[PDB]
Structure formats: structure tokens, C-alpha cells
Design a binder for this molecule. Structure first.
Ligand SMILES: [Hg+2]
Ligand SMILES: [Hg+2]
Ligand SMILES: [Zn+2]
Length: 255
């Protein structure tokens, strides 16, 4: 599986039949049909004690890993019940500025989309979390091309070090608070992981407010390889899944 013409999203069903499941993600967020739910509590993001460990190219994106052996970096509140721990974050991007995000708003596509992945602690480990309908919580933030994002530069600069598939680099003392928008207003719906095994375990939390990044920062993302070192070069671009049928589900808004 990949994002090419021969192994792209359109082929994934063959290997993972859940691909045409009931609660697949990403989806289009129709701002007029979303339901304002007054019963939604404000999100609670506690990342002051986060411990970053490393970054690695997994061949489909780059992951920034965190120490999730304790309640160091947690998400709670909003539509959630219990504490969810930060395990990693990654992005999806395009080949051009006009495409890149997974989720869309009124059919609008963003340059990229950041995913902060968290697992429900009542389940003890990530691996067991992905066996539950409420096992994960992903915070999705959109990136638009404008001003440079100070807080993202630490990541941009290291990309040179993890150019091909399978490379990793120590990546400590990275503060994820630098990537969050000013406002925490959001839409939420039940879905799935957006990459194989596409398991339907996620409560999606998509922030209304985008963060801006500069042209040069996104340009660096586009310099990554899908391929392993010493192999034909294939630029890591358009590593996004197209929107999936909502299928009855209701998207709720906290505003
Ligand atoms: Hg999953
Ligand atoms: Hg699940
Ligand atoms: Zn993702």
C-alpha cells in the first residue's frame, strides 16, 4: 500500500476490506449541516510535561514519537470520556499548496494536515486501544501557506537527517504546544485511522482554526522520500486519503 496509481487509496480495499466500512475517515465537513451541540465541554490539552524521543521516516510520512509510559502529555474533555495519551504526531501534505489535507471544509482543501494521535489509557497500551471503538483520539489541525510557524522550524531542520524510509533521529525537548492555533473550537465525529489498517477506533477532533506555515517550510516536507536509501527516488508528496462517505454519521460542532 502507498499513494501511487498502482497502490493508492483506491486499491486499499483489497488488503483491508474495512476501507469501505461504516465509519471511514477523512470526510468533508459541511459547515451548514454540522450540529451545534451545547453539551460539548471545552477541550483540555495538557502538553506542558511532554517528552519527545525521536522522529522517523516510516515510508508514508514522518512520525515524532513521545514517551507515553506515564500521563505526561494528555488530552481530555470535549467529547471524550477519560484521559488519552499522546503517542505521536505526523502530517499529510500535497505536491502543491492547493491540496494536502485529508479532511475538507465545505470542500476546501488545505496545504497539509497535522495529526496528534492519542490512546485511551483505560486500555493500557496503544495496541489494545486499536481494538476498541473508543480507543483513539486524533486532534487534526489544518495548515495554510502564509507566515512562517516558529514552532515548526525544529522539525523542518531535522528532515534532512531522515530523508529515506527507515531512517530515524533523536528528537528530544520538542514542545508540541508550538503547533496549536489560538482557538480550540472544533468539529467532532466518529471515524477511523486514515492509513492501513484503517481501524474504526477514532474519535476525530478537528480544529476550526488553521495554523499558517511558510512556503519554505512546506517545501522541505516535499523533499522527503517514500523509498529506502539506495533506491530509485520517489518524492514523498500527496500522502493523503480522499474524503469518504459520511454514511448517516453526524458531525457536531463545539461552536
Ligand atoms: Hg485504529
Ligand atoms: Hg477499533
Ligand atoms: Zn494522519
Amino acid at each position: 500500500w502507498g499513494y501511487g496509481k498502482h497502490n493508492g487509496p483506491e486499491h486499499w480495499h483489497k488488503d483491508f476490506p474495512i476501507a469501505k466500512g461504516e465509519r471511514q475517515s477523512p470526510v468533508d465537513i459541511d459547515t451548514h449541516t454540522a450540529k451545534y451541540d451545547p453539551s460539548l465541554k471545552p477541550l483540555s490539552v495538557s502538553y506542558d510535561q511532554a517528552t519527545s524521543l525521536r522522529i522517523l521516516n516510516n515510508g508514508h510520512a514522518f512520525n515524532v514519537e513521545f514517551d507515553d509510559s506515564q500521563d505526561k502529555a494528555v488530552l481530555k474533555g470535549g467529547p471524550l470520556d477519560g484521559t488519552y495519551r499522546l503517542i505521536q504526531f505526523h502530517f499529510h501534505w500535497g505536491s502543491l499548496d492547493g491540496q494536502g489535507s485529508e479532511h475538507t471544509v465545505d470542500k476546501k482543501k488545505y496545504a497539509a494536515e497535522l495529526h496528534l494521535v492519542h490512546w485511551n489509557t483505560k486500555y493500557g497500551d496503544f495496541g489494545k486501544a486499536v481494538q476498541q471503538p473508543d480507543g483513539l483520539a486524533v486532534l487534526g489541525i489544518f495548515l495554510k501557506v502564509g507566515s512562517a510557524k516558529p514552532g515548526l522550524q525544529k522539525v523542518v531542520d531535522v528532515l534532512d537527517s531522515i530523508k529515506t524510509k527507515g531512517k530515524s533521529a533523536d528528537f528530544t525537548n520538542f514542545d508540541p504546544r508550538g503547533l496549536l492555533p489560538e482557538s480550540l473550537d472544533y468539529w467532532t465525529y466518529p471515524g477511523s485511522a486514515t492509513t492501513p489498517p484503517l481501524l474504526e477506533c477514532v474519535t476525530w477532533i478537528v480544529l476550526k482554526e488553521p495554523i499558517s506555515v511558510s512556503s519554505e517550510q512546506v517545501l522541505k516536507f516535499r523533499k522527503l522520500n517514500f523509498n529506502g536509501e539506495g533506491e530509485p527516488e520517489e518524492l514523498m508528496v500527496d500522502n493523503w486519503r480522499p474524503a469518504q462517505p459520511l454514511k448517516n454519521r453526524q458531525i457536531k460542532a463545539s461552536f
